[PDB]
Design a protein around this ligand. Structure first.
Ligand code: FKS
Ligand code: K
Ligand code: K
Ligand code: ZN
Length: 607
């Protein structure tokens, strides 16, 4: 798997609302032209394999629609304006054009082309700049601004033409995709997640099925997840707490073979129909947190977004992470608001009967590797290798100051890898630890690095303190090591490669994102349990703009380390840990949700 696909055609911009209708005036053809021109300006569309648009055959349109309804819209190109707005009134909040039936077939055919490109390994992922939208249309009705359900096409299409059993659909538009839910209501093959502006049913489409109540029907119960926003103005911490505490936990245990997203960017600050406060760069992290799933095979499909002057900002942030570009640091993170915590609390409980990890107790080169000198590995063409008189004087300065061996090559490289990163990231095999870890961050704290995230697996204490607020330590052991300092975290069978994940999504990732570090420092000791380190290394790349320095003490582990630093696809894990292991997590979630509010998944108890 190599590039990334971008499907688009100017022809889908040649149909518009031809009368006065305040319901659909926000839906204009200029949404599609500004999104491509934004990708063109920032030097993004030129970096993606442009797959041409095809039409969707009526053999494919009947996968999710009835013949009675397809023949009804097939007669629209011959209707005049008087006849068109009469046909548009038989449906709710939608308009039709002389060219809309032609563009809607291009709408489905665009996503299907994206599905084929991603599933044939032609590309690693992709995005479809497409109009009209999709997730409102049902089996025999047009609704919202949509005619045919674009990503519901893709799901049954991928279910049919590729024999895939587990497809994850994410709908981060803030309108409920009721067409998706209806299509796969009784279907456990397709897991549909959807957050949306609800306001206690006050907001369109005003459906009871949009509430967290609806989990599914029949054998498909458990694979429909609705997270209703009950107040407007949700921020980045609200959106990320959602991912960390409901979507990502069940996604990795769902272990999807293909992830499809309903990209709606009215969830961003400035959109008149969404009225939310999330910055455009939050979408760079939404996609990134979904890349370890399905080995990266992710097909983004456009839905909503109406602030023309800011819609292009988030479509580029989506493509930026799609190409693997460094994600921007998110500052100002904290606790989700009380209503967001109320919604995340409710659906976590209603879904707890299926995803049991929700139960509660009663109340251009971007990496550099310096491996043990003399080794030669096969590196994916975006890596390099090794000091200098500028650097050696610093190593000599530190040599007699605080501390002979060949570890002075460990240090000379460790200094120059950090000088080079402040290239994106790196990784170094190290001799003795304490001198390597000490020289690493002590040289990093003066790089300058405002704050330094530190992740270390192994036992015993590492050689640095967490007194001030410029450092935070993550550690996974075999012993208890009950800590008291809040700027730290110590954690801990065959359940290790399965319980560590939900401890990374539910605990490690939330505190780090609030920490907003300038540099991540990964350390492991020789001691292994390797089936998971690649999944970890991938998701922290969302912090510190990707700058992470890994220190292995080396085994075959190095080959998998650099795999995620370089941006390659990440191996799936396959689909529940120990009870004493999650008692370990909430014993430190209650301890840490004081300082770091992003760990909270319930509304605070008032004193
Ligand atoms: N202010 C009045 C508008 C009321 N009609 C609701 C519009 C539905 C929005 C559709 C959408 O944004 O969800 C899509 F992604 F499909 F494009
Ligand atoms: K939605
Ligand atoms: K479902
Ligand atoms: Zn929308």
């Amino acid at each position: 798997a190599s590039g990334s696909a971008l499907i688009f055609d100017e022809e889908m911009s040649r149909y518009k609302l031809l009368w006065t209708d305040p319901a659909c005036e926000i839906e204009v053809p200029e949404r599609l032209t500004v999104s491509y021109e934004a990708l063109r300006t920032h030097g993004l569309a030129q970096r993606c394999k442009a797959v041409p648009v095809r039409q969707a055959t009526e053999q494919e349109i009947l996968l999710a629609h009835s013949e009675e309804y397809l023949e009804a819209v097939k007669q629209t190109p011959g209707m005049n304006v008087e006849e068109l707005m009469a046909f548009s009134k038989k449906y709710n909040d939608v308009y039709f054009h002389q060219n809309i039936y032609h563009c809607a077939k291009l709408a489905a055919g665009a996503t299907l082309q994206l599905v084929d490109s991603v599933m044939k390994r032609e590309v690693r992922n992709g995005m479809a700049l497409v109009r009209p939208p999709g997730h409102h249309s049902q089996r025999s009705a047009a609704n919202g601004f949509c005619v045919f359900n674009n990503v519901a096409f893709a799901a049954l299409y991928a279910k049919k033409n590729y024999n895939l059993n587990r497809i994850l659909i994410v709908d981060w538009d803030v309108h409920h995709g009721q067409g998706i839910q209806y299509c796969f209501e009784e279907d456990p093959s397709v897991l549909y997640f959807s957050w949306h502006r609800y306001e206690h049913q006050s907001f369109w489409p005003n459906l009871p099925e949009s509430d967290y109540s609806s989990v599914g029907k029949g054998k498909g119960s458990g694979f429909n997840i609705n997270l209703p926003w009950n107040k407007v103005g949700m921020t980045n911490s609200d959106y990320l707490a959602a991912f960390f505490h409901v979507l990502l936990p069940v996604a990795y245990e769902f272990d999807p073979e293909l992830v499809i997203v309903s990209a709606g960017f009215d969830s961003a600050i400035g959109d008149p129909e969404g009225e939310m406060c999330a910055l455009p760069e939050i979408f760079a992290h939404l996609t990134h947190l979904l890349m370890p799933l399905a080995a990266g095979k992710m097909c983004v499909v456009l839905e909503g977004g109406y602030n023309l002057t800011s819609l292009g900002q988030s479509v580029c942030q989506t493509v930026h992470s799609l190409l693997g570009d460094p994600t921007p640091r998110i500052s100002g993170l904290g606790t989700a608001c009380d209503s967001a915590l109320e919604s995340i609390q409710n659906v976590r409980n209603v879904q707890s009967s299926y995803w049991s990890s929700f139960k509660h107790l009663a109340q251009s080169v971007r990496t550099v590797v310096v491996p043990p000198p003399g080794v030669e590995l096969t590196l994916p063409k975006n890596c390099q290798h090794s000091i200098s008189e500028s650097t050696a004087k610093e190593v000599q300065r530190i040599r007699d100051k605080h501390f002979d061996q060949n570890i002075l090559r460990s240090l000379g490289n460790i200094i120059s890898v950090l000088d080079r990163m402040m290239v994106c990231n790196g990784c170094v095999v190290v001799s003795d630890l304490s001198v390597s870890v000490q020289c690493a961050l002590q040289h990093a704290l003066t790089e300058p690095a405002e704050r330094v995230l530190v992740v270390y697996v192994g036992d015993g204490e590492l050689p640095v303190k967490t007194n001030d607020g410029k450092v935070f330590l993550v550690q996974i052991c075999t012993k208890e090591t009950e800590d008291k300092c809040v700027n730290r975290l110590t954690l801990c069978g065959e359940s290790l490669t399965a319980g560590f994940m939900q401890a990374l999504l539910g605990l490690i990732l939330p505190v780090a994102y609030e920490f907003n570090p300038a540099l991540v420092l990964g350390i492991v000791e020789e001691t292994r349990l390797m089936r998971v380190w690649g999944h970890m290394t991938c998701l922290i790349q969302g912090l510190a703009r990707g700058r992470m320095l890994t220190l292995l003490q080396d085994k075959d582990l190095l080959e998998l380390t650099v795999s995620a630093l370089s941006g390659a696809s990440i191996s799936p894990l396959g689909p529940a840990p120990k009870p004493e292991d999650v008692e370990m997590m909430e014993k430190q979630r209650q301890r840490l949700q004081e300082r770091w509010g992003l760990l909270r998944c319930t509304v605070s108890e008032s004193w």
